[PDB]
Amino acid sequence: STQREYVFIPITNSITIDVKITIGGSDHITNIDERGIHNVLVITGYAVDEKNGRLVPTLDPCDYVKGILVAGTPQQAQSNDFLTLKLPANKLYLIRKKGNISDDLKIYIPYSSPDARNSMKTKPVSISDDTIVNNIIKEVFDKIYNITQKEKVKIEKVKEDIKELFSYYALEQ
Amino acid sequence: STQREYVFIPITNSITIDVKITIGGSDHITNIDERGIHNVLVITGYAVDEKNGRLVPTLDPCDYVKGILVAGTPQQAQSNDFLTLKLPANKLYLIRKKGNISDDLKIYIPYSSPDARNSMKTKPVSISDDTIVNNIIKEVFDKIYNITQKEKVKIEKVKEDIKELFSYYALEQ
Amino acid sequence: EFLDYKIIALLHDPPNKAWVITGRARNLTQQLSRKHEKVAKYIINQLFGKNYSEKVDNADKLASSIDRYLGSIVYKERSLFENRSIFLKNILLSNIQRDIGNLFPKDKSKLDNLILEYKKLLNVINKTNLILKYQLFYLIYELVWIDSKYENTPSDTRNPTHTIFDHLYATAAMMNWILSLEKEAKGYLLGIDTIGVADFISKGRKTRDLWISSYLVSALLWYVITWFIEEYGPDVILFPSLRFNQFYAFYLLEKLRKEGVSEDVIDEIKELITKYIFNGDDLFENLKIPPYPIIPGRITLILPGLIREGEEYKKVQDDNCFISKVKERYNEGWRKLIEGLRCYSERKREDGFWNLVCRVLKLTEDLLQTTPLNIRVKQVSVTEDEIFNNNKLRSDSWKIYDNKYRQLVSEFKKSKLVKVTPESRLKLFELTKFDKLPQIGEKSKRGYEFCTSCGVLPAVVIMPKEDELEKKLIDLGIARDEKDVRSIKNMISPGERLCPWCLVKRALGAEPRLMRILLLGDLYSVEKIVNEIVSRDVKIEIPSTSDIASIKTFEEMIEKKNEICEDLKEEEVCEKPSESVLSMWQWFNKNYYNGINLTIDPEEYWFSEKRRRYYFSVFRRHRITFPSPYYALVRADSDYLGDLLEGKLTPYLAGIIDSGDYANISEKKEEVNKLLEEYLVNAGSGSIVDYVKTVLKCIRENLNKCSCAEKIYSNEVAKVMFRVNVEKANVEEEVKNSLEYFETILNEGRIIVTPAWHVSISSALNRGLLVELELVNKHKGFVIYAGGDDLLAMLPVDEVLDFIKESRRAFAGFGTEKLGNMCLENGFVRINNAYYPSLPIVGRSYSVIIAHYADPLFFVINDSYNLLEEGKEIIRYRVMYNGEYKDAKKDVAIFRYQGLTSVIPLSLKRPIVSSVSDFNEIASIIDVILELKKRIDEGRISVSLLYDYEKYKHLIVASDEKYLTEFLVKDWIKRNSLRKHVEFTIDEKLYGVRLTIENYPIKIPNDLISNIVYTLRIIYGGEK
Ligand SMILES: Nc1ncnc2c1ncn2[C@@H]1O[C@H](COP(=O)(O)OP(=O)(O)NP(=O)(O)O)[C@@H](O)[C@H]1O
Ligand SMILES: Nc1ncnc2c1ncn2[C@@H]1O[C@H](COP(=O)(O)OP(=O)(O)NP(=O)(O)O)[C@@H](O)[C@H]1O
Ligand SMILES: [Mn+2]
Ligand SMILES: [Mn+2]
Ligand SMILES: [Mn+2]
Ligand SMILES: [Zn+2]
d(CA A151, CA A129): 26
Q: Which of A36, A61, A91 sits opposite C103 (nearest CB)?
A: A61
Query: Which residues in chain B touch residue A91, judged by CB atoms under 8 angstroms apart?
Result: 58-60, 62-63, 120, 122
Question: Residue C737: how many CA atoms within 13 Å on its side-chain side?
Answer: 20
Interface test with A, best of B43, B95, B119 (most A CBs within 10 A): B119
Q: Nearest CA to C408 among C322, C289, C294?
A: C322
For residue C300, which ligand has an atom nearest its CA?
2
Distance CA C693, CA C712 (A): 10
Residue of the nearest CA to atom 6 in ligand 2?
A: C642
Please give the Cα distance from C731 to C713 (Å, whole number): 8
Take atom 8 of ligand 2 and give the residue whose Cα is closest. Answer: C642
SS3 state of residue C254: helix
Question: Within 13 Å of residue C749, how many CA atoms lie on the same side as its CB?
Answer: 22
* C637 marked among binding-site residues: yes
Question: Which residues are paired to C979 by β-bridges?
Answer: none
Which amino acid, one-letter code, is at C977? S
Report the alpha-carbon distance of residue A87 to residue A74 in Å, rounded. Answer: 19
- Burial of A21 (C-beta count, 10 Å sphere; 0-12/13-18/19+): middle
- If one residue of C200, C641, C649 were mutated to test the ligand 2 pocket, choosing by the most ligand atoms within 8 A of its CB, it would be C641
- C701 conformational bin, left if phi > 0, alpha if psi -120 to 50, beta if neither: left
Q: 3-class SS at C904? A: strand
Q: Which of C798-822 are b and which e, b meaning 16 or more Cβ less than 10 Å from the residue's Cβ? A: bbbbbbbbbbbbbbbbbbebbbbbb
Which one, of C800, C808, C807, C891, lies nearest residue C851 by Cα?
C800
Among chain B residues, CA nearest to A83: B114
Greatest extent of chain C over all pairs of C-alpha atoms, in Å: 97
Helix, strand, coil: what percent of chain A each, to 5? 10, 25, 60
Question: Residues near C663 by Cβ (< 8 Å), separated by ≥ 6?
Answer: none
Distance (Å, whole) CA B65 – CA B50: 12
Return the amino acid letter for C291: P
Contact predicate C190/C176, CB 8 Å: no
Q: In terms of residues, how long is chain C?
A: 1024
Distances (CA, A) of C39 to C16, C79, C102, C993: 8, 18, 17, 57
Task: Please name the method used to determine this structure.
Answer: cryo-EM
Q: Are C771 and C839 in contact (CB under 8 A)?
A: no
Determine how β-strand C440-441 pairs with β-strand C461-462. Answer: parallel
Number of H helices, E strands in chain C: 41, 19
Which of C876, C890, C864, C874 has the alpha carbon at shortest distance from C1006?
Answer: C876
Output the CA angle B92-B96-B102, nearest 5 degrees.
45
Query: Which of A36, A97, A100 has the CB atom closest to C274's CB atom?
Result: A97
Cβ distance C752 to C398 under 8 Å? yes
DSSP one-letter code for C13: S
In DSSP terms, which residues pair with C638 in a beta bridge?
Answer: C844
**DSSP state, A7?**
E
C789 lines ligand 2 (CB under 6 A): yes
Q: How far is the CA of C511 from the centre of ligand 6 (A)?
A: 19
CA–centroid distance, residue C326 to ligand 6 (Å): 27
Instruction: Give the integer Cα–Cα distance in Å for C655 and C910.
Output: 8
Chain B residues closer than 8 Å to A49 by CB: none
d(CA C108, CA C577) in angstroms, rounded, equals 56
How far is the C-alpha of C278 from the C-alpha of C392, rounded, in Å?
43
Closest residue of A to B116, CA-based? A85
CA distances from C311 to C3, C350, C358 (A): 12, 47, 41
SS3 B100: coil
Question: What separation in angstroms does the CA of C189 have from each of B43, C161, C174, C397?
Answer: 48, 25, 11, 16
The answer to whether the CB of C197 falls within 8 A of the CB of C297 is yes
Strands A54-57 and A46-49: antiparallel
Burial of C1017 (0-12, 13-18, 19+ CB in 10 A): middle
Q: How far apart are CA B122 and CA B124, in angstroms?
A: 7
Contacts of C92 (CB under 8 A, 6+ apart): C651, C837, C839, C840, C841, C842
Asked if the bond preceding C240 is cis, omega within 30° of 0, the reply is: yes
CB contact at 8 A, C583 and C620: no
Tell me the backbone φ, ψ of residue C216, rounded to 5 degrees. Answer: -65, -45
Cβ of residue C928 lying under 6 Å from some atom of ligand 1: no
Query: SS3 for C912?
Result: coil
Beta bridge partner(s), residue A87: A105
Pairing assessment for the beta strands C885-888 and C875-880 based on DSSP bridges: antiparallel
- Residue C1013 near residue C901, CB atoms below 8 Å: no
Is the CB of C239 within 6 Å of ligand 2? yes
**Eight-class DSSP state of C868:** H
Half-sphere exposure of C189 (CA within 13 A, CB side): 20
> Rounded to whole angstroms, what are the CA distances from C236 to A41, C172, C293, C606, C1010?
39, 9, 21, 52, 50
Distance of alpha carbon C953 from alpha carbon C247, whole angstroms: 52
Nearest one of C787, C421, C454, C856 to C635, comparing CA atoms: C787
The Cα C405–Cα C400 span in angstroms is 8
State the distance from the centre of ligand 1 to the C-alpha of A60, rounded, in angstroms.
49
CA-to-CA distance for C183 and C47, rounded, in angstroms? 22
**Edge-to-edge strand order for the sheet containing C828-831?**
C823-825, C828-831, C834-837
Q: What is the rounded end-to-end Cα distance, in angstroms, of chain C?
A: 70
Q: 3-state class of A41 per DSSP?
A: strand
Q: What is the stated resolution of the deposited model, in angstroms?
A: 3.1
SS3 C112: helix
Q: Which residues have a Cβ under 8 Å from the Cβ of C155 and sit 6 or more positions away?
A: C13, C17, C64, C66, C161, C162, C163, C164, C167, C756
Cβ contact C917–B95 (<8 Å): no
E-strand ranges in C611-689 read 630-638
CB of residue C191 inside a 6 A radius of ligand 1: no
CA–CA distance, C102 with C22 (Å, rounded to integer): 13
Query: For a substitution probing ligand 1, which of C200, C790, C792, C862 has the most ligand atoms within 8 Å of its CB?
Result: C790
In Å, how far are A92, A157, B58, C577, C724 from A165, measured between CA atoms?
A: 18, 12, 23, 37, 50
Q: Per the CB < 8 Å rule, is B59 touching A92?
A: yes
Q: For residue C424, count CB atoms less than 10 angstroms from its CB and return exposed for 0-12, middle for 13-18, buried for 19 or more.
A: exposed
Hey, is C645 helix, strand or coil? helix
Q: Measure in Å the smallest separation between the Cα of B75 and chain A Cα atoms.
A: 17
Q: What is the C-alpha separation between C749 and C746, in angstroms, rounded? A: 5
Burial (Cβ within 10 Å: 0-12, 13-18, ≥19) of residue C743: middle
Residues of A in contact with C103 (CB under 8 A): 61
Find, among C844, C835, C780, C784, the residue nearest to C812 by Cα: C844
Burial class (CB in 10 A: 0-12, 13-18, 19+), A76: exposed
Contact between chains at B96 and C97 (C-beta distance less than 8 A): no
Does C864 sit in the ligand 1 pocket, CB within 6 Å? no
- Euclidean distance between CA atoms C148 and C336, whole angstroms: 41
C777 touching chain A per CB within 8 A: no
Residue nearest to atom 31 of ligand 2 (CA): C641
Count the neighbouring beta carbons within 10 Å of the beta carbon of residue C509.
Answer: 21
**Rounded (10°) CA dihedral C135, C141, C147, C149:** 180
C802 labeled binding residue? no
